[PDB]
Amino acid sequence: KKVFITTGTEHYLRQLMANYTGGNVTLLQNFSQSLLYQESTGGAEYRVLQSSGSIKGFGVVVFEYIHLRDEEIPIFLQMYQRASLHFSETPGLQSTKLTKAMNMNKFLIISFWDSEVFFHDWKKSPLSKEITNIMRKNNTQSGFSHEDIYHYP
């Protein structure tokens, strides 16, 4: 089980998504480009480690790219296991995916929110404080940890 993330013009991505149906395929955008979110099997490719909830097709979508040192991986997975049991009770949270890059220790958490206000409330949570701290302390030898926010066309 995988997530494919492809960025480009709306026209390009709309042509691309017309080869496919199903896989919770979702077109998103920011102020200058579009982004295609695609669940499939076999741009950028990520293995899905965990999925909660389901996409409602409105609001905002947040991509948190997190580089982890070897020793941080088991610890991070256990934090995420414990925190994920409460995602159903997180206000305005539709869906979350924990995913990993094929070629590196780069993890990507994708969260689908009813509104940016709910996402920003969640940023006060212990899970978000830890994620942010991990992003903050990243060894940039590996690339940058970053958070990207998208809306719906």
* Total structural domains within the chain: 1
CATH number at residue 76: 3.30.70.100
d(CA 107, CA 58): 24
How far is C-alpha 24 from the geometric centre of its chain's CA atoms?
14
Range of the domain at 81: 1-153
Helix, strand, coil distribution of the chain in percent, nearest 5: 30, 40, 30
Task: Report yes or no: 100 and 90 within 8 Å, Cβ to Cβ.
Answer: no
Write down the experimental method used for this entry: X-ray
111: left (phi over 0), alpha (psi -120 to 50) or beta: beta
Packed helices 126-136 and 72-84: angle between N→C axes, nearest 10 degrees: 160
Neighbouring-strand partners of residue 99: 48, 108
d(CA 124, CA 120): 7
d(CA 52, CA 27): 20
d(CA 97, CA 51): 4
